[PDB]
Design a protein around this motif. Structure first.
Motif, PDB file in Angstrom:
ATOM      1  N   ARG A  38       0.843  -1.175   0.000  1.00  0.00           N
ATOM      2  CA  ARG A  38       0.000   0.000   0.000  1.00  0.00           C
ATOM      3  C   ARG A  38       0.885   1.234   0.000  1.00  0.00           C
ATOM      4  O   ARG A  38       1.642   1.459   0.939  1.00  0.00           O
ATOM      5  CB  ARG A  38      -0.928  -0.004   1.214  1.00  0.00           C
ATOM      6  N   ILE A  39       0.796   2.005  -1.077  1.00  0.00           N
ATOM      7  CA  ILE A  39       1.632   3.181  -1.273  1.00  0.00           C
ATOM      8  C   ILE A  39       0.803   4.457  -1.223  1.00  0.00           C
ATOM      9  O   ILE A  39      -0.307   4.516  -1.746  1.00  0.00           O
ATOM     10  CB  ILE A  39       2.374   3.102  -2.619  1.00  0.00           C
ATOM     11  N   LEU A  40       1.358   5.474  -0.582  1.00  0.00           N
ATOM     12  CA  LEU A  40       0.744   6.794  -0.510  1.00  0.00           C
ATOM     13  C   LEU A  40       1.724   7.812  -1.041  1.00  0.00           C
ATOM     14  O   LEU A  40       2.866   7.843  -0.598  1.00  0.00           O
ATOM     15  CB  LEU A  40       0.369   7.127   0.935  1.00  0.00           C
ATOM     16  N   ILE A  41       1.284   8.648  -1.978  1.00  0.00           N
ATOM     17  CA  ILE A  41       2.143   9.720  -2.430  1.00  0.00           C
ATOM     18  C   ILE A  41       1.443  11.060  -2.147  1.00  0.00           C
ATOM     19  O   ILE A  41       0.231  11.223  -2.355  1.00  0.00           O
ATOM     20  CB  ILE A  41       2.541   9.522  -3.920  1.00  0.00           C
ATOM     21  N   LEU A  42       2.221  12.008  -1.638  1.00  0.00           N
ATOM     22  CA  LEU A  42       1.712  13.310  -1.215  1.00  0.00           C
ATOM     23  C   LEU A  42       2.060  14.372  -2.241  1.00  0.00           C
ATOM     24  O   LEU A  42       3.228  14.608  -2.522  1.00  0.00           O
ATOM     25  CB  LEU A  42       2.299  13.700   0.144  1.00  0.00           C
ATOM     26  N   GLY A  43       1.043  15.010  -2.802  1.00  0.00           N
ATOM     27  CA  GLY A  43       1.250  16.054  -3.791  1.00  0.00           C
ATOM     28  C   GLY A  43       0.538  15.693  -5.074  1.00  0.00           C
ATOM     29  O   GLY A  43      -0.009  14.605  -5.191  1.00  0.00           O
ATOM     30  N   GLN A  80      -6.157   7.310   7.255  1.00  0.00           N
ATOM     31  CA  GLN A  80      -5.901   7.077   8.674  1.00  0.00           C
ATOM     32  C   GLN A  80      -5.140   5.783   8.921  1.00  0.00           C
ATOM     33  O   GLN A  80      -4.290   5.713   9.806  1.00  0.00           O
ATOM     34  CB  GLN A  80      -7.220   7.061   9.457  1.00  0.00           C
ATOM     35  N   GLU A  81      -5.484   4.751   8.153  1.00  0.00           N
ATOM     36  CA  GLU A  81      -4.855   3.441   8.274  1.00  0.00           C
ATOM     37  C   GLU A  81      -3.404   3.542   7.867  1.00  0.00           C
ATOM     38  O   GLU A  81      -3.094   4.243   6.899  1.00  0.00           O
ATOM     39  CB  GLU A  81      -5.570   2.427   7.391  1.00  0.00           C
ATOM     40  N   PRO A  82      -2.510   2.852   8.596  1.00  0.00           N
ATOM     41  CA  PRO A  82      -1.102   2.902   8.192  1.00  0.00           C
ATOM     42  C   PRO A  82      -0.906   2.314   6.799  1.00  0.00           C
ATOM     43  O   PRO A  82      -1.704   1.471   6.370  1.00  0.00           O
ATOM     44  CB  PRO A  82      -0.387   2.062   9.266  1.00  0.00           C
ATOM     45  N   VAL A  83       0.115   2.793   6.092  1.00  0.00           N
ATOM     46  CA  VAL A  83       0.474   2.262   4.786  1.00  0.00           C
ATOM     47  C   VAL A  83       1.898   1.712   4.839  1.00  0.00           C
ATOM     48  O   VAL A  83       2.597   1.843   5.845  1.00  0.00           O
ATOM     49  CB  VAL A  83       0.386   3.342   3.692  1.00  0.00           C
ATOM     50  N   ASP A  84       2.333   1.105   3.745  1.00  0.00           N
ATOM     51  CA  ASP A  84       3.657   0.508   3.693  1.00  0.00           C
ATOM     52  C   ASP A  84       4.724   1.527   3.301  1.00  0.00           C
ATOM     53  O   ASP A  84       5.846   1.484   3.801  1.00  0.00           O
ATOM     54  CB  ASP A  84       3.655  -0.668   2.715  1.00  0.00           C
ATOM     55  N   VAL A  85       4.377   2.422   2.381  1.00  0.00           N
ATOM     56  CA  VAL A  85       5.329   3.408   1.871  1.00  0.00           C
ATOM     57  C   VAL A  85       4.628   4.741   1.697  1.00  0.00           C
ATOM     58  O   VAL A  85       3.564   4.794   1.089  1.00  0.00           O
ATOM     59  CB  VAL A  85       5.936   2.992   0.512  1.00  0.00           C
ATOM     60  N   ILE A  86       5.224   5.803   2.238  1.00  0.00           N
ATOM     61  CA  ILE A  86       4.759   7.167   1.996  1.00  0.00           C
ATOM     62  C   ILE A  86       5.831   7.912   1.224  1.00  0.00           C
ATOM     63  O   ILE A  86       6.963   8.003   1.696  1.00  0.00           O
ATOM     64  CB  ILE A  86       4.476   7.930   3.306  1.00  0.00           C
ATOM     65  N   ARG A 133       7.546  -0.266  10.530  1.00  0.00           N
ATOM     66  CA  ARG A 133       7.003  -0.895   9.326  1.00  0.00           C
ATOM     67  C   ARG A 133       7.030   0.073   8.139  1.00  0.00           C
ATOM     68  O   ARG A 133       7.654  -0.192   7.114  1.00  0.00           O
ATOM     69  CB  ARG A 133       5.569  -1.380   9.571  1.00  0.00           C
ATOM     70  N   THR A 134       6.354   1.205   8.295  1.00  0.00           N
ATOM     71  CA  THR A 134       6.195   2.155   7.192  1.00  0.00           C
ATOM     72  C   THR A 134       7.513   2.787   6.761  1.00  0.00           C
ATOM     73  O   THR A 134       8.276   3.273   7.587  1.00  0.00           O
ATOM     74  CB  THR A 134       5.213   3.279   7.576  1.00  0.00           C
ATOM     75  N   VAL A 135       7.756   2.800   5.455  1.00  0.00           N
ATOM     76  CA  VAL A 135       8.915   3.468   4.878  1.00  0.00           C
ATOM     77  C   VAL A 135       8.484   4.843   4.369  1.00  0.00           C
ATOM     78  O   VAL A 135       7.438   4.958   3.734  1.00  0.00           O
ATOM     79  CB  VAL A 135       9.526   2.644   3.730  1.00  0.00           C
ATOM     80  N   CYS A 136       9.277   5.872   4.665  1.00  0.00           N
ATOM     81  CA  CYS A 136       8.987   7.227   4.201  1.00  0.00           C
ATOM     82  C   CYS A 136      10.118   7.736   3.333  1.00  0.00           C
ATOM     83  O   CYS A 136      11.279   7.666   3.714  1.00  0.00           O
ATOM     84  CB  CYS A 136       8.760   8.176   5.378  1.00  0.00           C
ATOM     85  N   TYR A 137       9.761   8.215   2.147  1.00  0.00           N
ATOM     86  CA  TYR A 137      10.733   8.638   1.151  1.00  0.00           C
ATOM     87  C   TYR A 137      10.399  10.051   0.696  1.00  0.00           C
ATOM     88  O   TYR A 137       9.314  10.297   0.176  1.00  0.00           O
ATOM     89  CB  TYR A 137      10.733   7.664  -0.045  1.00  0.00           C
TER      90      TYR A 137
END
Length: 274
Positions: free
Chosen positions: A121-126, A178-184, A208-212
């Protein structure tokens, strides 16, 4: 001898000449690489002038969209990105634009940092050109889901619309996250000045979560600090992306893949000097 440049403004402190000179030494390539300062409103003129004799060049922000409009031809990934960061002169004298930013990001993430994307599960901001430039190569890794979140959700909805056919990409307003993701992945330029979005602490599951961060600076970015304080498993900035997008461009130009590891090692040594 073949000539390459980095187009930019300001461009005095660019790392790109060092990077490609080291690449060229590594791989035995006979070329020179210099900076080219383009006035902010005269990029196309500068590029036309350079490519009378020049072979290729990298294009920095804020010029990537103008470069996309200037080209005679575009690679498929540059077409999808709406932005060109790599210009090449072809044998028939025409100008071709490519985009290696997405390739650089995914290579740094998956190969250098050993972060899995498939099934995650990936989240990208922007929702700017920075996001549009990386959606395709992320989706090629077959994540479970790719959520685009932005201050104005309509811009995120438009991006999801453009890449819908390439995978499970969706837009969302922050209020629903709200739920945690794997990669932000942070892609917001304004975040360097402290404009972080209203994202919940719970998006990061500690360990757990990786932030890039696609952004980087000499010091950890505001987003990186946020991630570290929440105990993200790994926290990265954009330095590896810089090196890998450059290596991909070098390969597009020269047909040989350089080793980024000793180049990143030199860049980090210079950062350590401060």
């Amino acid at each position: 001898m073949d000539q390459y440049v980095v187009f930019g403004n300001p461009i005095g402190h660019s790392k790109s000449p060092l990077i490609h000179r080291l690449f060229a030494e590594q791989t035995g390539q006979d070329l020179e690489y210099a900076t080219l300062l383009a006035p902010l409103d005269e990029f196309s003129d500068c590029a036309r002038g350079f490519f009378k004799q020049g072979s290729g060049g990298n294009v920095t922000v804020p010029f990537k969209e103008e470069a996309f409009r200037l080209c005679d031809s575009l690679t498929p990934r540059a077409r999808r990105a709406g932005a060109v960061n790599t210009l090449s002169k072809l044998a028939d004298g025409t100008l071709q634009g490519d985009n290696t930013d997405g390739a650089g990001l995914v290579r740094d993430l998956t190969v250098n940092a050993g972060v899995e994307l498939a099934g995650k599960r990936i989240l990208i901001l922007g929702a700017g050109g920075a996001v549009r430039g990386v959606l395709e190569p992320i989706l090629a890794h077959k994540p479970q889901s790719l959520v685009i979140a932005n201050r104005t959700v309509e811009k995120a909805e438009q991006l999801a619309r453009e890449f819908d056919e390439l995978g499970p990409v969706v837009a969302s307003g922050f209020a629903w996250l709200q739920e945690p993701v794997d990669v932000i992945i942070n892609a917001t330029s304004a975040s360097l000045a402290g404009e972080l979005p209203p994202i919940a602490d719970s998006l990061v599951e500690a360990g757990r979560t990786v932030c890039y961060d696609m952004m980087y600076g000499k010091e950890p970015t505001p987003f990186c600090q946020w991630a570290t304080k929440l105990g993200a498993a790994k926290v990265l900035d954009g330095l590896g992306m810089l090196a890998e997008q450059a290596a991909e461009a070098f390969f597009i130009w020269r047909g040989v893949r350089p080793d980024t590891a000793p180049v990143l090692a030199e860049l980090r040594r210079q950062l350590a000097r401060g």
